[PDB]
Amino acid sequence: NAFQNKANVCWAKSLVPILETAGIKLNDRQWSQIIQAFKEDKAYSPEVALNEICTRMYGVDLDSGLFSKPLVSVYYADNHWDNRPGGKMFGFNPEAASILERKYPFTKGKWNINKQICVTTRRIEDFNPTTNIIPVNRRLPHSLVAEHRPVKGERMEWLVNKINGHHVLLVSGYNLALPTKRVTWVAPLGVRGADYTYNLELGLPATLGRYDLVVINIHTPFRIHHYQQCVDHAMKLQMLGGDSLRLLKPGGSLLIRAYGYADRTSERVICVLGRKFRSSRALKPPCVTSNTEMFFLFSNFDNGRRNFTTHVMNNQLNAAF
């Protein structure tokens, strides 16, 4: 409602009109609890945020079609979101709501009263921070862990030294000892000792050049459930993962620390990234730091548009989790 003391939530203000079509009115507290990026006042994407809000408020994600009706546009330009025409359009979809009412009769006529709808424990009350964590409509691409658990393992070097590619770009909050490599370390603003510091909430600048191996090594704190960690990490996949493509030499590889792709946003990013490499793997090396952690390894970059399904990564991550 207020957006008091928030300088980077232009994306959130762009969702207000879209939420209105659904009858949803979020205040500052509710914005913060749902989306970590809002709480920390960080750059973000309206569609991505709308997915989290749809999941929490309705118990289902955007793939239910609840907001697929073109009523309000979200326009992106010059690192800024607003509501000019000519952008992706969203809006509450009564047709989609009707379909949902088949499986969940108790929801009928309760969509647009600014109330949270939980079919699990059939309740209709004001927003509850612990309600509707995981979307009921979405079939998870791979197993998640039931309880988060810290894990002490080996260093990163033993995974990185095995990956082909001499010239390495390291995007991390801390440095790694990679002797066999020629490393260029990029860190967030404020970090000392790195070759370059940038605001990683704006992605990576293509002026960094192209490398044989790009290692994205940014952690995302655990919150609530394994699925939620994937959610909280998705934007990073989009931002740092996508921008890395302009920083890859022909035949280059991309290593990304992640936690899978349990959510819709994450799986999208992976599919997009996969089409650009000769192979794609989901790794759970001994150098993981937690129960939910893993690594994406995209090999041999040719900037192409090949066929890519997550069926093979789905089996790899089922064994990991």
State which residue, 265 or 310, has the beta carbon closest to Na ion: 265
Q: What minimum distance in Å lies between the beta carbon of 162 and Na ion?
A: 31
Q: How many CA atoms lie within 13 A of 30 on its CB side?
A: 19
Q: How many CA atoms lie within 13 A of 176 on its CB side?
A: 27
Number of residues that bind Na ion (CB under 5 A): 4
Q: What is the DSSP string of 204-240?
A: --GGG--EEEEEEE------SSHHHHHHHHHHHIIII
Q: What minimum distance in Å lies between the beta carbon of 227 and Na ion?
A: 10
Among 231, 262, 270, 294, binds Na ion (CB under 5 A): 231
Q: Which of 10, 167, 219, 271 is catalytic?
A: 10
Q: From the centroid of its chain, how far is CA 222?
A: 13
Q: Which residue is nearest to Na ion (CB)?
A: 234
State which residue, 241 or 252, has the beta carbon closest to Na ion: 241
Interface region with Na ion, contact rule CB under 5 A, candidates 122-130, 165-173, 229-237, 306-314: 229-237
State which residue, 48 or 156, has the beta carbon closest to Na ion: 48
Alpha carbon of 289 to those of 142, 181, 190, 259: distances in Å?
20, 23, 24, 11
Known catalytic membership, residue 80: yes
Q: What minimum distance in Å lies between the beta carbon of 235 and Na ion?
A: 6
Q: What minimum distance in Å lies between the beta carbon of 239 and Na ion?
A: 12
Residue 237 to residue 48: CA distance in whole angstroms? 12
State which residue, 214 or 231, has the beta carbon closest to Na ion: 231
- 251-310: contacts with Na ion (CB under 5 A): 265
Residue 299 to residue 252: CA distance in whole angstroms? 7
Interface region with Na ion, contact rule CB under 5 A, candidates 7-15, 89-97, 233-241, 312-320: 233-241
Q: Which of 54, 80, 118, 271 is catalytic?
A: 80
Known catalytic membership, residue 271: no
- Which positions from 16 to 55 touch Na ion by CB under 5 A, shown as an x/- string? --------------------------------x-------
State which residue, 24 or 35, has the beta carbon closest to Na ion: 35
Helix (H) or strand (E) holding 186: strand 182-188
Nearest C-alpha neighbor of 73 from the set 56, 52, 90, 54: 90
Would you say 232 and 265 are in contact if contact means Cβ atoms under 8 Å apart? no
In angstroms, what is the C-alpha Rg of the chain? 20
Helix (H, G, I), strand (E, B) or coil at 66: coil
Q: What minimum distance in Å lies between the beta carbon of 267 and Na ion?
A: 11
Residue 37 to residue 14: CA distance in whole angstroms? 15
Amino acid at 269: V
Among 12, 234, 247, 255, binds Na ion (CB under 5 A): 234
State which residue, 140 or 234, has the beta carbon closest to Na ion: 234
Would you say 159 and 283 are in contact if contact means Cβ atoms under 8 Å apart? yes
Site residues (vs Na ion, CB under 5 A): 48, 231, 234, 265
Active site amino acids: 10, 80
